[PDB]
Design a binder for this molecule. Structure first.
Ligand SMILES: CC(C)(O)CCn1cc2cc(NC(=O)c3cccc(C(F)(F)F)n3)c(C(C)(C)O)cc2n1
Length: 286
């Protein structure tokens, strides 16, 4: 492919021997999740993100699938793969570094970062919808749209990441994958459709408006998607749930974003808008 093949020794060298201590303590660990750990590295005179993968053949399939999707899909709102390593004792994927990490971490202000403004949140929602539109236009279903998989660059531009479970309505699967707090009912039953990505994006829009995680075991409701029912049954208002860590949110645009989220979250897959309609509505909002 057009990607660089890196030596495992070069990647081990540039991540301080895959130093598992967090970056805040002087180590190289930036994150963990998606079948591996992500480390900060320095190749040539550039900061990079090195994901070290850790079923053996199931992990190799995710490695191959990510490379395949990345070779085909290049867009301003998608992460960029620079290279890979498959020669040492572990599989590695090398990406262009995202200085502002994930939307999940910026919404929680992890490591003391300042709360995102409403202006920045609108740009992020638009950017993420543009990335999903590119994936759907190129006949790919992400299957794990969530705030942890929306990364933020040096200008807080939204970049969709983690295409290891992406698939090139309609199709069924015996291996149900995804993150339960973001999954559409039909996705939880094994259906594979881009309509499920829309539902997950609706949960992301609620996270952007409220600053709350999609699931919190010590919260009522535990699942963020359940606030749609509280608002519909007039028990609460969207105003009650707006993230208090903002000083520039205006009711009109917050209600406009909530209307998009509510439409995405329709329980019936055929009643949800498609990604092009979601993009149009988010563009009209600003
Ligand atoms: C406190 C601060 C200085 O504002 C933030 C520091 N920071 C910088 C990060 C970069 C990250 N990721 C990437 O650069 C990155 C880029 C492309 C792909 C991938 C992935 F697929 F492997 F996930 N990760 C992350 C994770 C690993 C979570 O995505 C967390 C970070 N935190």
């Amino acid at each position: 492919t057009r990607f660089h093949s890196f030596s495992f020794y070069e990647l081990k060298n540039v991540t301080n021997n895959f130093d598992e201590r967090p970056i805040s303590v002087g180590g190289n660990k930036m994150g963990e999740g998606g079948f591996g750990v992500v480390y900060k590295g320095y190749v040539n005179n550039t900061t990079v993100a090195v994901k070290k993968l850790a079923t053996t053949e199931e992990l190799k399939q995710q490695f191959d699938q990510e490379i395949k999707v990345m070779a085909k899909c290049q867009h301003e709102n998608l992460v960029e793969l620079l290279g890979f390593s498959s020669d040492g004792d572990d599989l590695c994927l090398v990406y262009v570094y995202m200085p502002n990490g994930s939307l999940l971490d910026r919404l929680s202000c992890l490591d003391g970062t300042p709360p995102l403004s409403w202006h920045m949140r609108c740009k992020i929602a638009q950017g993420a919808a543009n990335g999903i539109n590119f994936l759907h236009e190129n006949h790919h279903i992400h299957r794990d749209i969530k705030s942890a998989n929306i990364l933020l660059d040096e200008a807080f531009t939204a970049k969709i990441s983690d295409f290891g479970l992406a698939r090139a309505q309609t199709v069924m699967t015996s291996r149900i994958v995804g993150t339960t707090a973001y999954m559409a009912p039909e996705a939880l039953r094994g259906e594979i459709t881009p309509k499920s990505d829309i539902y997950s994006f609706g949960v992301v829009l609620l996270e952007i408006i409220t600053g709350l995680p999609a699931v919190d075991e010590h919260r009522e409701p535990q699942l963020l998607l359940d606030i749609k029912e509280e608002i519909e049954d007039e028990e609460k208002t969207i105003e009650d749930y707006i993230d208090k860590k903002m000083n520039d949110a205006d009711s009109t645009s917050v209600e406009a974003m909530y209307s998009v989220a509510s439409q995405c979250l329709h329980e019936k897959k055929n009643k949800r808008p498609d990604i092009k309609k979601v993009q149009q509505l988010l563009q009209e909002m600003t």
